[PDB]
Design a protein. Sequence first.
Length: 118
Amino acid sequence: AAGLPQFGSASALSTSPLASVALSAAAAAAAGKQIEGPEGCNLFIYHLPQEFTDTDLASTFLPFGNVISAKVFIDKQTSLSKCFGFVSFDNPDSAQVAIKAMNGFQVGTKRLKVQLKK
């Protein structure tokens, strides 16, 4: 071939008669919301297990314009539920107000620690 391939997009992987394929686990990096923006309105919270998603916090504070959310799940093996989420606000002080004035994870009995950083 000419040696000119097209990249940038993930293509489908078909199976082959070769059989015997090595399976490996991968940790995708998806951000609860829109791409990154101007920092200064960001918040780091840590209260709940892996079930804590970044999208919930972003949505709540959303006046917090450019919304970039990520999450950090923590469990020793499978049975430990303690964890934190990361959020990144890129907007006027309004996003800042979202962070100081608002906790980020409520569970029937849990409250997330919202630590503000501008």
